[PDB]
Subunit: 485 residues, 3 copies
């Protein structure tokens, strides 16, 4: 006789299908990335800027507590602790601050340059500081910033700078808001002052806004900062009748795109990644992951899922077409070089021979299925975490609804795709075995008896040569047409 | 003697579509599209909406006299307004960052007013000033939550502060009055060249009054401009004014339980419960989709632009007087007389005849189709959302972006829903076809040449097959060798 | 004598992909990805775009002399500009909420410039002032819709005028303030120092003071003009008041809107064609659900995907000489000789041979595959959208959010369109394979043992089968008993 059979093994891998849960299969492929390396890493060769617990404002203004910082000239993203300790040491605010953060999120070059040496403010006092910025602990001040009356006069404070640096330049300035009209006169002599800044494209003025306020870092006063991007060869003009907090430096900046800020206590560790999360980096070909929604880089789609396992092998039995676990009741652990094949028995022996033709065709098909699911997934650079101020709650919620919206689409589609394709893979195997069975059946015709269990019992002697012809589709029916029926 | 293989039919006229075929009549079906609502405005997880009627949130917080019996509740999970609330700034003017204020109070768990600046302590200023714009019966009146004009012929500097000892963050509103003319300025405040300043740990503002002729609104060329801040616990707010300050008398303690939204509808609350509210009524469903209204609040099915999503659960209904070729194929029709299963046998022998369901195939199909339905339904994620959003008339672009987002997901879900239904119905009908073909073959491969295939799902035995014999056929233990009585064939 | 079952083949070199297999040649196919356009800028549902060419919207509404008789239409559906317009604020400055204003006039049902404040009626001021920045041929000029108010002799008295919107429609009105480079300039032009510009309607109240400060020369000028706008409601009044530095409108624009749209950037000019879907490369006219022409569309468009190709198999695998084992299986090749159907018979007997399509199964398959193609196309919901948006340089995060949203939908639709094609193509090929298998079994069950089943789709008769008999096989009326007395010899 000769029987048609299929592979079984010792596998305990389970998959789900649209019709059935926890099916054991001989082989399966997990498409959900669940692991990371526990490290903060460089992105495509370039490290993050690490701010420790300094804020971007604290760093750029020169909060004295941010002195021992260490600022690379180039970075691919920014790492901050969740709530930075050192920001505006002299209390106040920073206009369009989240727009500024977004801009410097990834740069190809960054370099501080002295643009308005403080000693050239020759008719104002320049040494003013505050205990709120105290070092050691004498009053001090933002190290990058500088004006009060000299003797008893505050003449117009007017200076300009031409960006001949070769790159666009980031420039910050501020205006001080005193406690009361008496302090206004003490510091700046005149009341009703202004700070004007102008370039070819920016025209901005602030005036002092005096109010009674509780002390913050010991001070009732506030400083309000603003910023601009000065283009190559343009001029910035400062013009103030008082209250100006002038920059001494500006920042040369070249951008190669935008990135984002990552909130984490982790420190850079000298490895390479293409996809960073606050928990660690991911290195994967898989199309989905569930590590963390706030990633930076070229990452798989984040889904709300614990498990996405594609079946690749067949039901492990140690279907639509009725053969596997069907009229062929069980698998063969003894057939090791194929998914499908034969067992024979005659005068010369017995028995297993894998069918390489249908096995290979199936392997190729399932390889294509898997490649299709994984490769079709687009993966461009994105930074998920975003910055919004406390008066942009609606905009932060819009962003959230959008991220939530995409998370629902992808999680549902990923779960359904796996269930549907798993059903079809199981049926594909079932069909391949049925077809191999019928291939034999249709060769033998009435020269053999169809037992009903996968086996054919010949009506003639069928030796090893005969058997081989049955297995490769060249069985000579007329030759044995003598039936003994 | 004979045994026939067949499948259930009934009196169903339910129709489904499939990828390959439209309006296929099936024996059973299940709609996964929620189309009904209860006509009521409900509580959401036990917690009622704040019902503002035709007052705006401004009108309510300021204390527009037309809102007086507003009936504010301690706790709320969303806010209900009429489409265009008529009672707002009774004295005309504006409200800075109003939408962000509306977003913040959309869902709160403790809401309590605190009389932070008792009006009676403004002892050196007049405090009863009012307007016919806010008239009550029909005397001049004013926002009940707000208060300053000269006392006699003097307006001394006005200076008061409040330390938030209330135990929670506090919402505080104040305004400035922009008079129509210098004479109004002098009448009200005596002083000219005035200011209003307010400071906290994080707020710093000084406003100066704008005197200018404007068209009259509710009788007034003057305007009032309001602003708001949240005072942190233990922080201090300081007001100082030489004139034109509209002072708050009250602040509002706010503990937010996340965020929700405002629902525009004419409906009023009705002592019912729900997880998903629409302006037309509440939705109570396990279904993954609905088409009732896009502006929902709660944990809602996905909204789609569809009128019907019907999943086949039973087979093609073929009452008598596919891929596998059995159903409506080599087995011509179904059997209304077989009622205890989807698939089975009809037999005839010396003893009688003869319907019997195949409990194995039938149970397969039950479990499989239940799993399919459960998969399509259970795998859908449903998180809390308030769809309708507030944008000012200078935020059209932002409004349009929200719209583009909502429209985009609507097209995604609608297309995927409709196609999933067509595709799964095709597979379902084929699944049943397969189960019938498999049942037939199970019988055929056992019987081999001890019976003849009579065509139409039937086998005629070449031997006597009593009830005991039939059972062995039906449960798959038939004894071929036992029956060579069979030379009946030859 | 014999009859064989077979299927159509031809010389199609059309390839598709399936989930299991790449580059399969099929007899027939259809792309559902729209890749063509008419290369033209068209009317959108009958209504033309406003064509601004190398002018910006600001250049146009203020009346920059280069945007003068720009030639407008009273109605438009979208606005076309060059990518980088040359003519905008010729006197340098800015426009407050400019993007909101661009978005407002993107689509209008009516638009008409009206003279609301004739410049001759500024009797106490000079009205002819201009700038070399706006030079015409080559005398100083100015924005033609605006009036630069300057002093008359040595005096600038209070400038005060108002206008009542009795036009019957809402009216766009624009005004500006001049921020001089220096005190000398302020005095030469306006005489007074410490001036202001005030503007007020029923809902708007604005006061601005000029900012005198040295700035880099733009178009020769260190001064700047800052513009603002408002919509004046029907029968509302706008009040202008100034002691200097006011740039007054002479005109306003009646506007009626019925929805919004967007700005398209392209060099193309309008060409007298019609469309529902404009791209900057040309208009699309398609029923297809997907396209790859250009992401910045305006209208009701297919979904944009990053696919080069989306080809659905419609015919079967082309095997010029599967789950069900017949096509490219035990029936090893297709027949180029069967031209009148997809599946059929080849017969051979005494009278000759012998191709004939099975009309019924062919037509059933055509109906099925037609429903499948229609399903994929017809279920796609489409709505009006203008993809291209305007954001200022301080709106990068908002611009990034918009981009993330578009990239997100691009990812969803691409992945799903591609996999849908792969998956449905696998099912379409198996559907054909099953149709052939079923036709094959129908012949098998008819002939029974009156014929030899060879195993390659052919049946060899144990009796003589003439054309009449061959025909009964073909149409399901073969008479087994009739030839039983003859067949096999036995
Ligand atoms: C310059 C000086 O010594 N001025 C005396 C003020 O110190 C003083 O009031 C106290 O000021 C305390 C804060 O003092 C500083 C600070 O910020 O540390 C002292 C700095 O030298 C001064 N810097 C200057 C003027 O450039 C800084 C500045 O004035 C303010 O921050 C402006 O808002 O103030 C703190 O405010 C105490 O609450 C306040 O009493 C008054 C009273 O002691 O006399 C001033 O001469
Ligand atoms: C107190 C009084 O007699 N005031 C007379 C002014 O009313 C009047 O100018 C006319 O004012 C008309 C509105 O009258 C009220 C109002 O808003 O109803 C009267 C209110 O008492 C007053 N509120 C106060 C004083 O706290 C209110 C207020 O002054 C304004 O709203 C401030 O903008 O005015 C109306 O607006 C007429 O258009 C206007 O002429 C003058 C001149 O007739 O005499 C005042 O005695
Ligand atoms: C606004 C301004 O004055 N920018 C100048 C530019 O005019 C000049 O060509 C260049 C020469 O160094 O320096 C810079
Ligand atoms: C044509 C006319 O005189 N009627 C209206 C009037 O009712 C309205 O109050 C005014 C606005 O001030 O505009 C005008
Ligand atoms: C040609 C032949 O075989 N005869 C019959 C014919 O009379 C009948 O009409 C047809 C069904 O349409 O079936 C066959």
């Amino acid at each position: 006789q000769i029987c048609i059979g299929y592979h079984a093994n010792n596998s305990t891998e389970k998959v789900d299908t649209i019709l059935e849960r926890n099916v054991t299969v001989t082989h399966a492929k997990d498409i959900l990335e669940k692991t990371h390396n526990g490290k903060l890493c460089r992105l495509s060769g370039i490290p993050p800027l690490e701010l420790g617990d300094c804020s971007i404002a604290g760093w750029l203004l020169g909060n004295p507590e941010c002195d021992r910082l260490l600022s690379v000239p180039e970075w691919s993203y920014i790492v901050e602790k969740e709530n930075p300790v050192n920001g505006l040491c002299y209390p106040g605010s920073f206009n369009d601050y989240e727009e500024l953060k977004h801009l410097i999120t990834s740069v190809t070059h960054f370099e501080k340059v002295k643009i308005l040496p403080r000693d050239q403010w020759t008719q104002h006092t320049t040494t003013g500081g505050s205990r709120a910025c105290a070092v050691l602990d004498n009053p001090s001040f933002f190290r990058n910033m500088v004006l009060t009356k000299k003797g008893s006069n505050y003449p117009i404070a007017k200076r300009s700078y031409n960006n001949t640096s070769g790159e666009q330049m980031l420039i910050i300035w501020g205006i001080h808001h005193p406690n009361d009209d008496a302090e206004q006169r003490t510091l700046y002599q005149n009341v009703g002052t202004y700070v004007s800044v102008g370039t070819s494209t920016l025209n901005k003025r602030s005036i002092p806004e005096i109010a009674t306020r509780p002390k913050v870092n010991g001070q009732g006063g506030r400083m309000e900062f603003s910023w601009t991007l000065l283009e190559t060869w343009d001029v910035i003009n400062f013009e103030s009748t008082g209250n100006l907090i002038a920059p001494e430096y500006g920042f040369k900046i070249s951008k190669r795109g935008s990135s984002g800020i990552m909130k984490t206590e982790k420190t850079l560790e000298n490895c390479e990644t293409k996809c960073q999360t606050p928990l660690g980096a991911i290195n994967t070909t898989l199309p989905f992951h569930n590590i963390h929604p706030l990633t930076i880089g070229e990452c798989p789609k984040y889904v709300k899922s614990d498990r996405l396992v594609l079946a690749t092998g067949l039901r492990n039995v140690p279907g639509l077409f009725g053969a596997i676990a069907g009229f062929i009741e069980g698998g063969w652990q003894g057939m090791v070089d194929g998914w499908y094949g034969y067992h024979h028995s005659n005068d010369q022996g017995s028995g297993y021979a894998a069918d390489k033709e249908s096995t290979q065709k199936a392997f190729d098909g399932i390889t294509n299925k898997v490649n299709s699911v994984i490769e079709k997934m687009n993966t461009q650079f994105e930074a998920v975490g975003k910055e919004f101020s406390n008066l942009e709650r609606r905009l932060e919620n819009l962003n959230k609804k959008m991220e939530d919206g995409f998370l629902d689409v992808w999680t549902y589609n990923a779960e359904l795709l796996v269930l549907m394709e798993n059903e079809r893979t199981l049926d594909f195997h079932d069909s391949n075995v049925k077809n191999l069975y019928d291939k034999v059946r249709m060769q033998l015709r009435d020269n053999v008896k169809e037992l009903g269990n996968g086996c054919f019992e010949f009506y003639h002697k069928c030796d090893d040569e005969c058997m081989n012809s049955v297995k490769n589709g060249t069985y000579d029916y007329p030759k044995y047409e003598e039936e003994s029926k």
